[PDB]
Amino acid sequence: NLWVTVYYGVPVWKDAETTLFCASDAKAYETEKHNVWATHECVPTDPNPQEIHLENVTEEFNMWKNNMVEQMHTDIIELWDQSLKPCVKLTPLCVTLQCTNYAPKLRSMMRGEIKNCSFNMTTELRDKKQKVYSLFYRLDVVQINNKEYRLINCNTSAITQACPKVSFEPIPIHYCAPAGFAILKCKDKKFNGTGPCPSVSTVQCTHGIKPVVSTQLLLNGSLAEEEVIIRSENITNNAKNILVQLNTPVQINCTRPNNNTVKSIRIGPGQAFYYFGDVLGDVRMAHCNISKATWNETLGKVVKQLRKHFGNNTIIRFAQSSGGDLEVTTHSFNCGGEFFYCNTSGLFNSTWISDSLILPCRIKQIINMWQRIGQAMYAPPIQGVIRCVSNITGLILTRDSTTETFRPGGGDMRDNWRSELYKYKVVKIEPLGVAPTRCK
């Protein structure tokens, strides 16, 4: 009575992993030739945001199993490694350093911080050396026991000059999926992290993503839309971290207020590196500001969201972070050539029951990006002063009776992107279908 009737082009999918590629908003850069993020050799984005809504259909997501995280976290390491390759290797830099302090008569926090130093650097000739005076930081040199100092790297890694024409500004990146695939979108406000979004829609290619590297906080990111939103995986576990999204930003100012000087020395036949030569004016601490009353009002929204499903009749105690590396302890971020380390003990000294603010900031030169013992990038110094202004969007916490300790955590860079990929998943389109009908 009924025979099998085939159907082609049926709107049905499954869930699958696939390769996925760049999409840039086409601009006229032509200045730093290419940045770290290869915006050049990327396809220009269609300026038609075709965003097709899906009616009366639901789908449970999981922000904790997005393979899009693992694809992109592979790529960010790899692009970083790819651009870092063709520049100068500072192999002969690892020498014995005669050093002393730079401003020996100083009372401030910057006392004993910058260190004048001395070399015997190999020139471009084979049998000619050179005594070189330079400046370094506390967080770059190690004593040996004008006591002899030595850099950090030589314990573990090697050194690459960081190509002093490229930039580091995080370009917004779109991700177009290939044909025969689609990217779902949740669009549900107050989404849990794992649940059926009713208001789904889909696109070919996601919105802008700025791949910024940050610890303890989420600079420059995407806002929320309704309120403070809490996400985590196992709220009853102490191993899972805490994802916080804020409905409003905080304008952070940050600066490195020193008028500097960069010198250059040919050390090989073409190898000429740049170093922190001299400081004009006099030595000033680098710091960051924040509106205190705005931030308390911001933090007052947080604890209300906390006490909803956790610790109603229980005090909420914030503590400073525990310890370990600086990347897992303090706020760390690049801001266009400099790698800041701002102490954040003055933001987690607070409890609850039932006129600005200044953070001191350190900077380094030798960076171990993504915990890869074996690689160490030497950033070049920057002339002039730095005037970084940024928003804030997120917060990374962890939980340590009727007492609760929330310490600020971080470490994994992949948690930065789950704050940007929870709205999406990858589906494989299936244009087949077989039904019984009345025809033979």
């Binding site: 760049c22 050799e41 097709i52």
Partner: protein, 128 residues
């Protein structure tokens, strides 16, 4: 509606949207090799066979060209005999599809055997 516009709709209502489903399939000449050029090369490849492997199957199933065609193999009613006049324009494609999913492998080999083996001989048998 649009591409995947009738996703949670009636199968008869979503019967008349197949062209938009098929147009929105499959650039930059002179690729380099570095990082993104690998993925764009991978983007070109995966669009081909995922377009093509089922395009083989319609020639396997004799339903060459875009046709909502029907076979000559009867529907086995052991496969969830549920009101096939009624339910055919009630639920969705989607939720109905995973119901079928336990037996689709059994169907397909019979599809390439029913009219594709037998009824593709017999026109040669009358070709005299």
């Amino acid at each position: 509606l649009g591409f995947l516009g009738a996703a949670g709709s009636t199968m008869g209502a979503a019967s008349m949207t197949l062209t938009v489903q098929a147009r929105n399939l499959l650039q930059q000449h002179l690729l380099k090799l570095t990082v993104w050029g690998i993925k764009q090369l991978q983007a070109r490849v995966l669009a081909v066979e995922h377009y093509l492997r089922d395009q083989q199957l319609l020639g396997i199933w004799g339903c060459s060209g875009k046709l909502i065609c029907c076979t000559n193999v009867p529907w086995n009613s052991s496969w969830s005999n549920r009101n096939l006049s009624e339910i055919w324009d009630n639920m969705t494609w989607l939720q109905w599809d995973k119901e079928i999913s336990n037996y689709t492998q059994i169907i397909y080999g019979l599809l390439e055997e029913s009219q594709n083996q037998q009824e593709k001989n017999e026109q040669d048998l009358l070709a005299l």
